[model samples]
Target: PAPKNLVVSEVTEDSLRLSWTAPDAAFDSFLIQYQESEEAINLTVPGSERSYDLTGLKPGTEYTVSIYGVLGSYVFEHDVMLPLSAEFTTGGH
Candidate 1:
């Protein structure tokens, strides 16, 4: 399942934090994706971690972030549900 209560916090000129509640306890990792303009960044962390800090972003640019739950095998042999996504603009300098 997808994450819930996706929220943004700790905003700054070039950084911010994203957080959410996990949908299940069986996931192996969380997949995070953020996009700005035409650039995209992807990251993965253990399921126990539910927040991610993004840095090096444009001062006042809008970004779209998505989080997904990854489960099983770690080899694409399992299932990946829909993603939970949100959009936010960074603070200005």
Candidate 2:
């Protein structure tokens, strides 16, 4: 299944915590990405991990967070990223 129940918390002027639930999963690593405009940051984590702390973000700005369920080139229909209504704005300083 896809990673659902995306949540954000402990957001501050330049950092936030992001987590998602992918009850049962496949393959390899997670390419977690969050971006404000064209400036996107990618965090490559193991598939076993559930969340990551995003830092060096721009305060009071909108961002799109995406999670990629990679199967290490094994090929799956749900491979790569699956982005739904996952968007948020940071808290102001």
Candidate 3:
């Protein structure tokens, strides 16, 4: 199952924070993906942590962020279909 209720907060000129709740299953880590236009950044954090502090983003740009619950022995072969996505800006306008 995917993480639930992705919360985006503390958006600034260059960064933001995101949080989510683990679903009705076990997760080893969470896969975080943030993107603007054609550029995307991917990160992995231990499931023990429910929040991520992301930095080094362009100010005033709207970024699409996604969170996914990952299993310990997860494979990359299949499509990761579920994404708890949220969008926020870095104060450009």
Kindly state the number of residue pairs that clash in model 2.
0
Model 3 bad stretches (over 4 Å) = 23-25, 75-79
Model 3 whole-model lDDT (C-alpha atoms) = 0.76
For model 2, the superposed segments whose C-alpha errors exceed 4 Å read: 74-85
Candidate 2 lands at a TM-score of 0.80
Worst 10 residues of 3 by lDDT: 75-84
- Residue 28's lDDT within candidate 3 is 84
Q: Please, what are the lDDT tens digits per residue for candidate 3 over residues 33-71?
A: 889845688899887778888899988888889777778
lDDT of 1 by residue, 1-93 (tens): 446788999999899999888755757888788898446788888988878889888898889888777776352322234458778899995
Q: Considering TM-score, which of the candidate structures 2 and 3 is the better prediction for this target?
A: 3
Q: lDDT per model, in order?
A: 0.78, 0.73, 0.76
Superior by TM-score: candidate 1 or candidate 2 = 1
Clashing pairs in 1: none
> Which residue pairs does candidate 3 place in steric collision?
60-92
